[PDB]
Amino acid sequence: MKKTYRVTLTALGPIFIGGGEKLKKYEYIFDKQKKVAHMIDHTKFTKYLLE
């Protein structure tokens, strides 16, 4: 009766979940030999391309 636990997940392999977003080939992604992929925030980029 009402046994509460604390499930601790330790990823052995890679864990990926959902998102609802498909970031395109050009949309906010930059990878080079320093091996990072910065994601640019969404509306600030186009409101900075406004000016």
For binding to RNA (CB under 7 A), which residues are involved?
Answer: 16-20
Give the separation between CA 33 and CA 7, rounded to whole angstroms.
38
Count of other CB atoms within 10 angstroms of residue 9: 6
Q: Report which of 30, 26, 47 is spatially closest to residue 39, judged by C-alpha positions.
A: 30
Q: Considering the complex, what minimum distance in angstroms separates the CB of residue 23 from RNA?
A: 13
Q: Considering the complex, what minimum distance in angstroms separates the CB of residue 33 from RNA?
A: 27
Q: Considering the complex, what minimum distance in angstroms separates the CB of residue 43 from RNA?
A: 21
Nearer to RNA, 16 or 48 (CB): 16
